[PDB]
Every structure is written in C-alpha cells, then in structure tokens.
Amino acid sequence: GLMQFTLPVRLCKEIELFHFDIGPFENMWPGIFVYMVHRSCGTSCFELEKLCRFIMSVKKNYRRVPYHNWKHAVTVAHCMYAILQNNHTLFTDLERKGLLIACLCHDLDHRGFSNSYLQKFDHPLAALYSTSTMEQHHFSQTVSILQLEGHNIFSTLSSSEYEQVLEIIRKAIIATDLALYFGNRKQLEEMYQTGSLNLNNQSHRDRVIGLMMTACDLCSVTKLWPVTKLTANDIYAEFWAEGDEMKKLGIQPIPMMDRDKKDEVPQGQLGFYNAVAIPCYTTLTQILPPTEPLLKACRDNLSQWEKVIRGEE
Ligand SMILES: Cn1ncc(C(=O)N2CCC2)c1C(=O)Nc1ccc2sc(N3CCOCC3)nc2c1
Ligand SMILES: [Mg+2]
C-alpha cells in the first residue's frame, strides 16, 4: 500500500516528457512501467504482486527481434502515459487502467513479420484471423496471460467493468493495425472539421483511442533525432529480413523491405512522415491540444530526414 516506486532524478523529470527514451538498462523497464501505472492510475489500481507477475509474463512472451520487442512495448506504454498525464480529466478510471496494459501487450509474441507476409507464407494464424492477423493474435495472447493463476490484475473489477476493460484493450490492440489507421483518421478529420466530434459518443471515443494507439505505436518518430535515427535501423533490420523471406517464397518484396534499396531509405522516411506520421499527430493535436509536442518532434525529425537527402548528413 505505502510502497511507491521512485526513479533517479533525471528519469523522474524526463519520464513526464513525450520524447523520453527508457534507456538501455532492461532491468529498469518493469519499474518504469509500474511507476507510470501508479502516477497515471493510482497505487491502488492493481495488486502490486499480481501486476509484477503480469509484467514478467508479458516480457517473457515478447521475442528477441530487432524492433517488435519488449523495449518497443514499454516505449509505446510511456507515450500513452505522457498523453494521459497531459489530458488528466478526459479519460475514465477504466480507460487509464486498460490503455497502459493495452500498450504493454499490443505486440505480444510478434515474430518481426507483417500481416502480408503471414498471408503469403500461408501461416496458420492467417487461417484463424483473415484481417488484422497479428493484432488478433496479440489480444488473444493478452487474454491467455490474464488467465494464468495469480495474473488477473483486474480481479477486483465487477463482472461488467471487467468486460468493459477487456473491450477497451481489444479495440486498442486492433487499432494498432496500420491498415485500419487511414480510414480511422479520415473519419476523425471529418468529425472534427464539421464539429460533429462528441467524446460522450462511445463510437467517437473508440476512434480517438484508436488514433492515440497509432500515435503511441509510431512514437519512434517523436524522439530526439539520435533515438529516431537508431530506431530506424532496428525497424529496417526487420523489414529487410521479411524481404529476404519474401524472396525465398519467390516474391519480389516491396522496396520498403528490399535491402538492395538501402540508398532509398531517406526518401522512404519522407513518404512515411508525409503519408502517416504528420497526419496522425496533426489530427491527434486537433482533438487533444496538449499532445502538440509529438507533432512538433515529428516535424523536427521530418526536417532531419530532408537534411540527410540534401547530403548535410
Ligand atoms: C519509422 N516507422 N515507424 C513505424 C513504421 C512502420 O511502417 N511500421 C509497420 C511496423 C512499424 C515506420 C516506417 O519507417 N515505415 C515505412 C513505410 C513505408 C516505407 S517505403 C520505405 N522505403 C521505400 C524505398 O526504399 C527505402 C525505404 N520505407 C518505409 C518505411
Ligand atoms: Mg503491431
């Protein structure tokens, strides 16, 4: 009850900022996550013993892949923490509980391959889940860990509150399918501009939580340039491995995943910032003005990629 987590001063201060990097010390990541739950939710939200045991089972079920790993899980949870802390009164008690857990679980048991690759490989998961293949797997894995003895961190919720939180977590994990992002943001754009956006409309909240999930999931592009640049290496290491596997199935991969087109990476980052990142943080800032630092950091990084193309780095 009276057992807080406390971080060193530099971390205590920087963790509140959107651009915080959780650092290379893996053994501190669980404590950083519990710290965020305690300040975002309260020290009473979860039984500490059950929470710690849930965190270590989730960690164990992330794989040693270059990007879709345990560090990504905690990084995406920190961005959600930052959004929630800067928008105190906009979110219910169940949403704060659900969304930090959703972010930690959103890529559970990722193998470093896209939905496309599973479908062309004809992976068993592509027969079990025809769309959002990995995302339905990630939610399924989340429910599994929640049902290990001693792992039900939601045990003190009523039957109906329990169903609401698992429903929040399910929609939040499905929304990390970037194929669903484009249409979700277009709808949010129209609703905001025609003034029909209503946060008491549950279907509207769902859309806004979906955009938050895309924003947290892409947060590599909102860090300081040195973090953004070194994370891009991890991202492309997965993409190029998938490219290699596409070639092994007798399929030329898209350029994004072809390691023979390393030269085109800076221009590929431009298209991605313009087509996905900038629009994502723009619409998010319109709906949640205090998330403007994410849009500002994204724009800074776009400018850094333009400088790479111009040979200034
Ligand atoms: C930065 N970032 N963060 C998340 C993601 C992301 O897509 N997701 C899916 C799981 C993570 C990305 C990212 O870089 N995405 C991205 C998208 C289109 C193209 S086209 C291209 N080039 C083609 C031409 O040749 C060079 C590269 N490179 C890219 C890179
Ligand atoms: Mg994912």
Ligand SMILES: [Zn+2]
């Ligand atoms: Zn992710």
